[PDB]
Structures are given as structure tokens and as C-alpha cells.
Amino acid sequence: SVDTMALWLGLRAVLVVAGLAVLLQLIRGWLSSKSYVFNREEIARLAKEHSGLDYEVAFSKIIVELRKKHPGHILQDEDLQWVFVNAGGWMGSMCLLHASLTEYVLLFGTAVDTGGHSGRYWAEISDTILSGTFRQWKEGTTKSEIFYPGDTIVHEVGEATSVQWSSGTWMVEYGRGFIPSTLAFALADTIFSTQDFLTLFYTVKVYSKALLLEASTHLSQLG
Amino acid sequence: SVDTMALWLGLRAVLVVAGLAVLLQLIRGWLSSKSYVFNREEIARLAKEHSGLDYEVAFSKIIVELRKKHPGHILQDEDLQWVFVNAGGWMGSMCLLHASLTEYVLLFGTAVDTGGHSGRYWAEISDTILSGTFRQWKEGTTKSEIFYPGDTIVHEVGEATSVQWSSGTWMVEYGRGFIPSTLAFALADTIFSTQDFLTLFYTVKVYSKALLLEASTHLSQ
Amino acid sequence: SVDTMALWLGLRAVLVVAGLAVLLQLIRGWLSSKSYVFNREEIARLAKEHSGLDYEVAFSKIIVELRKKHPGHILQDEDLQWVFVNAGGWMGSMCLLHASLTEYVLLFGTAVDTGGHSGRYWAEISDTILSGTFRQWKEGTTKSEIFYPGDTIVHEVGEATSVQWSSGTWMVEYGRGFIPSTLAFALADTIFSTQDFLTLFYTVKVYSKALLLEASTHLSQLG
């Protein structure tokens, strides 16, 4: 009886703490900057246009088209690198092309069967599949949905789902919102599971390089 | 030679610390309360009786029967909610019906293929399959076992295994023992992997509501 | 505008911390002790010779041959135990036969489909398959390779990959280098995911027993 009351009080404390955390995340999402360089429809159309070719040729053509359409906002060939991404129980790899305080663009995918938590979104993400399959299991439902090359899954602000990718699944991902808040999730398993400090090095390095490119382009466009 | 001695001393320290942790868990489990509302055979039979229907109809009928035989011990329809559960490398979802200091009842399952650590049990758990398959790989053996709808897997007090569930696997779970000790494992991956603070919110909220229902029924009785 | 600079500075802090960690791991791995009892080719051939039999008979014969060719360096039958191993998102089981400050030998495998991060290697590992399949996805590439019984996968000093094992995959693993540096990765999921303190107990116990056996053999060979 007394232990039950103590447990209920502790659970209520954890409840209000977690609620405060979620509210602070929502506040940082709301009060974030809304200066956007790209649009989700643009990236979706550009990725869907090349979804029928081989995924490597699609990567190359999409990178060339992005550098053509937005000069100074895409990393150079010397800065492109495949970096592992372990998060929410799943493992894939990314190649970052653009990343700012409010937007990011990358090529994400896995060559093996994987799956796990989508990650509690607090920014808007869009994934247009180039190859493979994407099984999404939304919250509150007991059934999943499959998406194929050409489809574009939009992960909204409040959504959390179960993601699963078959072997050889590759897609182009564009994220809009409070981008730094995603880093934590993208590195969670890197910190407490894989102990891969060199992957963390590569991730923070490519993010810092993208931020430096954005600042340099800003200065060159106001200079 | 010296680094070997330092490593051995560190290993012995970790050994005694882990042993003390296990001893504290065992002591809190044994000297825990044993006031039981349900029995594992009751829940097992109730789930096996409706395992042949569709799993949603089975959920509905099992909830109705539980409210009929135990009215003040099952959450209301307004309090039922599917909450994600990330633990031991696997991901599923639960709907809690009953939960006290010594017992809990829920509907657990996944719509995708998943698997991982069963979690070092320090309470007794029972899962009666309604749909899908349950692959259990016990500790110390090199072979696994498959379980189908109608079967009931009993996770004993000391057992730790490797669990795996195929897509669309749904079952009814009843646990008796030191329930708070399970929260740690049930929230480990929620804390250090998914960063899903809202799922933690939902979990602690439904547990607090179940405890409140139990306390209200106790006070009214 | 200012937040971009602040975020870049924070990323530089994380960058230099991770770089120091990687450099310290490389330096502590280098200039390390070089007292080696086994060689990867010996273990590879011993396992490949018995890869055609049942994996349990193969385990037994390999243990007998290891005790025959290297007496006093393999644990006794009373000290052999199957211990779960949760790491990098995957889960298997091990039976440790030899383990020192510079080398370790064990029988590793899983009875279920599993996979995840290989673990950022800072020691040289070799896995010779007795049964099942081993899918390895090296870093920087978008395609994986499958290995079958008889094959030997060599995880080099700097490599990090994605490992995947099908149900019933069993192999003999020999690791050479700075063995303690692997311990962290071997226990990460045990600490922050499974909460399995008894598996941690078993792991540290068998490692201490292997170290004690090695020290006893050293003393008996100089005594």
C-alpha cells in the first residue's frame, strides 16, 4: 500500500518530466527559423525523375542537378563521403550533400535488411525511394504499409513509426525544421551501442563542413 | 604483466558490482508482495480460447471477458492506447489493461519482423500467442524453438533468452512479481536508443492510471 | 546567423574530443605488447577442416585440437559456458576458450537471424565459419558480400562494417591486438539495452578465469 503510493508518485514525477521535455522540443520546433532554400516538392520530383535508373547513376545525376540548380549550397566531390548511421536499432549509411541550421539533404540507405524506430520526429522529413522497399508501421495502428521506388514518404512533425528497409534500399532524404535536434537521435546508437567514435567524428565533420559552406555562400552572396 | 593485473582487478570489481546488483534484484523480487488478483492459467486459457478468431476480435472479446470477470481491475476504453515498446533491441507495441505493484496484464505484439533480448527476467511472465510466431532461444543452448497461436510461453524467474517475433504477431501477456523492476528494461532502449520522450510519457501515464484504478478499486472495496 | 557559428563551434568541440579518442585508441593499440600464442591461419585451417561436420562435433574437435597443440592456454571443461553477447544491435552467444591481454579465442554464433554494427575494430579479428552465412557490408561501399562455411572473414585494424548472421550461424573467432579495447563494445548493449547484469557477470567471470589461466601457465613455465 505504501510502496504503491511511492511508485505512483515516482511515476507522476517521471510523467511531468517527460511532458516538460516534449513541450520544450515542441517549443524549439515552433520557434525555429523558417528561411528555406529548398522545397520538399522539388527534392521529391528530382528524386522520382531518376528512380528508374540504377541507384548509383541516379545518385550521380541528382548530385549534378542539385549543384547545377543551387550553386554554392552542395558540397564538393572532395567532401562527399559514405558515413554509417546507427540509430533506433537500425543501421544504414548516409552521404550528406547540403545541411544548414534549418535544412539538410542527403542520400540515405542500407545494403542489408534492417529496421527499428523511425525516431520521434520534431522536424519535417521527406524520403523519396530510389531502390528497395520501405515498410512503415504508424503509431496506434496494427498494420504496416509498403512503399516502392518512386513513392515519397513524408514524416510529419508529430509522427513516430516503425521503419524497415530491405537489402539494397536507397533513397534521397530532405529534412526541414530544427536540424540540430535530429543529431542526437542520429548518434544515439553511436554513443551507447556501437562505440564507433570515428563515425561520430565523420558525422560532426561533414555537418561542420556543410555549415561552413553555407556561411561562406552567405558571405559571398552579401559580399 | 602489470596491465594484466590491472585488467584482472577491474574485471573482479565489475564482477562483484554485477553480483551485488543481481543480489539486490533477487532480494527485492522475493521479499515482494504476493497479493495476486489473476492467475497465469486464467489469462492463458482466456487467450487460447479466442486465438482462432481475428486478432482484433480476439482483443475485443478478451477485454470484454476480463471486464466481466474482473470489473474494477481493467482500464476503461478511454484509457486504452497502443504504446510503442523498444527494449533489448526489439520494437513492438502494448495495450495495458491491468497493472499493479505485483501484477500486470497487457496485449503485446508487432506488425513487423523484430527480435532481440528477452530481458533478464526477475518476474514471471506468460505469453499466449493469438497470431504470428514466437521464436525463443534459451540461454546455454545452441538451438531455438518455435511457438504458434494457442501455445503459451512461460518466462520463468531466472530465465534470459533471445526472443523473435514475425510480422503480425500478437499475444496476451500476464506478468506477476516485482513489476517496477521490469520498467528499467522496458525503457532502456527508449532512453538510450530511440530518444522517444513521448513514448516514455505514454508508458508512465498508462502505468500511473492503472495503479490509480487499482487503488480506487481497493479503496472502494 | 549567430546560431550557425555557435553550432559550428560545438561541432568542433565534439570533433576534437572524438579525434582524441580515436588517436588514443590507435596509439594504445600500437606500441602494445606483441606476445602472441596463436595465429589466425592456424585457427582458420583448424576450423575449415571441421566445417563439414555438425557444428557441435566441430566445436568439440576444435577444442580438443587447441588443447593438444597449445596446452595450458585453453580453459577446462568446468570453465566452458555459453554466454549471451549483445553488441552493436546484434545478439549472439560465445564460449571463450582462450583470452589474454593480446589475444582471445572463442566459439561464436547465433541460433536466430541477427545483425548490426561490427564494432569499430581496434584489434585484428578473424572469423572462420563452421555453419550458416555471414553477410559483411564494408564501410564506404553500397554492396555487401556473403561468406559460407569454410570462408574466413578478416576484420582488419581500422575496419568498421555491418555484420549479419542468419539463423544457425556458428564460427570460431580469434582476435589479436589490444583485447581490452574491444570489451567496451562487447558490453555496451549489455549496459544500455538489455540490463542483463548476470550476462555481464558471466562475461567478466570467464575473462578473469582466462586471464588467471594465462598467468598460471606463465608462472608454471618460469617456475
UniProtKB/Swiss-Prot annotation, chain B:
Chain residue ranges for the region called C-terminal hydrophobic region: 178-221
Q: What is its main location?
A: nucleus
* Listed transmembrane segments: 9-31
Keyword entries, A-Z: Cytoplasmic vesicle, Endoplasmic reticulum, Lipid transport, Membrane, Nucleus, Receptor, Transmembrane, Transmembrane helix, Transport
- Signal peptide residues are none
> Could you confirm whether the keyword Transmembrane helix appears in this record?
yes
Cellular component terms per the entry's GO annotation = cytoplasmic vesicle; endoplasmic reticulum; endoplasmic reticulum membrane; membrane; nuclear inner membrane; nuclear outer membrane
Q: Which Pfam families match?
A: ERG2_Sigma1R
Subunit structure, interactors included: Homotrimer.
Please give the function described in this protein's UniProt entry.
May function in lipid transport from the endoplasmic reticulum and be involved in a wide array of cellular functions probably through regulation of the biogenesis of lipid microdomains at the plasma membrane. May regulate calcium efflux at the endoplasmic reticulum.
Protein's name in the database: Sigma non-opioid intracellular receptor 1
Source organism of the structure: Xenopus laevis (African clawed frog)
Gene that encodes the chain: sigmar1
